[PDB]
Design a protein around this ligand. Structure first.
Ligand SMILES: CN(C)CCSSCCC(=O)N1CCC(O)(c2cccc(C(F)(F)F)c2)CC1
Ligand SMILES: CN(C)CCSSCCC(=O)N1CCC(O)(c2cccc(C(F)(F)F)c2)CC1
Ligand SMILES: [Cl-]
Ligand SMILES: [Cl-]
Ligand SMILES: [Mg+2]
Ligand SMILES: [Mg+2]
Ligand SMILES: [Mg+2]
Ligand SMILES: [Mg+2]
Lengths: 236, 10, 236, 10
């Protein structure tokens, strides 16, 4: 790895600089290098890893959606067929996206998840595993779409089981996991009723626990609660 | 419009 | 070159797709491949080349400015010196920026400029040469800042001489060249009075020629004229 | 604030 000669602390320092510079491909490479040092990650470091790769894959997902839409339009009765280029370039972006997802899943499997024993770290990583299988599912078609969906579901479910046992219903890790699992149900798994039920129960149980929170924690929890509400408004 | 997932938080 | 096996027309098609997807690094690679086919570029193709690399170098310039500002703050009396990382990462981004500039200058020198005989193509390319030397100047310090500035100046001046002989004062190529040369004078060459004089004369001579233009051409010219005015307001 | 140069035009 090209980051193998750099100090762990230097990699984290540069990841933060890259964040400030909006250089998210660099940020992701720095954080991959930090993970590959083999030590567990702190909360701040886990967040840097997530911010970096979410921004990278987010650009890829947006581009893939643009190209897929153009491709679908080109494949309609009455469209002047324009050769293989749209498909080729959509496939190029898709392969790069799948590569980023495989890289993140590889870091989780070797060996972030198995060394994560505290609930806050383990739930975070299992949610990430669900998320990156979900991004793979967004572009999957053939035989393996079913298996990718099941892998996402399994990771989210393990994370949910731990979060419900070990975290209060306002915990922002737990809330964002439930948010993303509800998105999985609506957008990937063709289960809008499950999505709505999960979003509603999550919201209501968090509402009832807000009285226990400080001002700052209340702001964190209610921000995610608003996203649950936004989706429920979209969905109903 | 697509559903909203957890955003990044600096 | 990795684009050597792709058809010229396919490269241009994919450059346009990459533009739609906001994938400007890809767009630039496709257009580099198209240039390296060795044929001259049409107006639309020259514009794709410019859009692609301007977006790539624009991201680099923004990132470099963020990192340079952090570095300058770290090098002030009373700043906890935090090791070599800020400088290292600023240098990394700077080297990547210089590489992009060198790539563009290389395409202009081999062989876009020497095959460009019409004023619209030759002025466009010489302006581009001035622009990418100007971006090099923005990060230059040592012995070669002076020589880089002179290279930018020389390219802009050749472009100006041709534009004044061969194009009307409202021509958008001529207007944007004058705009960028005025920015060179103010921001790079420490010549704010030259910058103001050039912006003012350019604006006034274009004003007096607007009556010759169609509605669509008038919209093009007045858009650039407004940028001259914006700068004159900033500068005075 | 930095001076404005020629923007991109699609
Ligand atoms: S520490 C291990 C967990 C971690 O790092 N997380 C990343 C950010 C976190 O999402 C979050 C915290 C506070 C507020 C928000 C909000 F959306 F409200 F702004 C989100 C929740 C998970
Ligand atoms: S064709 C060879 C020249 C070429 O391609 N150019 C790229 C765009 C051009 O800048 C331009 C044209 C029309 C309107 C604008 C405006 F700023 F008003 F929007 C800008 C001028 C040069
Ligand atoms: Cl391709
Ligand atoms: Cl570095
Ligand atoms: Mg037809
Ligand atoms: Mg594929
Ligand atoms: Mg001190
Ligand atoms: Mg240097």
């Amino acid at each position: 790895g090209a980051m193998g000669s750099m100090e762990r602390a230097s990699l984290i320092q540069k990841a933060k600089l890259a964040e400030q510079a909006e250089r998210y491909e660099d940020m992701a490479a720095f954080m991959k290098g930090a993970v590959e040092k083999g030590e567990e990650l702190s909360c701040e470091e886990r967040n840097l890893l997530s911010v970096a790769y979410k921004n990278v894959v987010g650009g890829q997902r947006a581009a893939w959606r643009v190209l897929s839409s153009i491709e679908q339009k080109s494949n309609e009765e009455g469209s002047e067929e324009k050769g293989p280029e749209v498909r080729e370039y959509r496939e190029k972006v898709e392969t790069e996206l799948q590569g980023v997802c495989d890289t993140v899943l590889g870091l989780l499997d070797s060996h972030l998840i198995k060394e994560a024993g505290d609930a806050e770290s383990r739930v975070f990583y299992l949610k990430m595993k669900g998320d990156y299988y979900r991004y793979l599912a967004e572009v999957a078609t053939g035989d393996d779409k079913k298996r990718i969906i099941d892998s996402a579901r399994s990771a989210y479910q393990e994370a949910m089981d731990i979060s419900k046992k070990e975290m209060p219903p306002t915990n922002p890790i737990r809330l964002g996991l439930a948010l993303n699992f509800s998105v999985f149900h609506y957008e990937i798994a063709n289960s809008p009723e499950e999505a709505i039920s999960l979003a509603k129960t999550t919201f209501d149980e968090a509402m009832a626990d807000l009285h226990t929170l400080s001002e700052d924690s209340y702001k964190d929890s209610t921000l995610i609660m608003q996203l649950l509400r936004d989706n429920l408004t979209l969905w109903t | 419009q697509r559903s909203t997932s957890t955003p990044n938080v600096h």
